[PDB]
């Protein structure tokens, strides 16, 4: 198919979100980050592995 299948409007395939903030006690490591799902793009969270 060649119609209405690809955005061709300059969006990334892989997105790396640095944590908004991070704290690290001597027992656990906690990170918080805000991920923004574009304006029209959609993802399933089978992706988004923690690196």
């Amino acid at each position: 198919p060649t119609h209405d299948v690809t955005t061709e409007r300059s969006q990334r395939l892989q997105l790396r979100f640095v944590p908004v903030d991070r704290e690290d006690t001597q027992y656990s490591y906690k990170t918080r980050f805000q991920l923004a799902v574009g304006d029209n793009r959609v993802l399933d969270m089978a992706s988004t592995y923690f690196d």
Binding site: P1, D4, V5
Partner: peptide
């Protein structure tokens, strides 16, 4: 019609 998106050739998994 959604045939444009379809390529042109021409969930009961729960147990323990």
């Amino acid at each position: 019609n959604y045939a444009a998106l379809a390529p042109r050739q021409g969930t009961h998994e729960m147990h323990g």
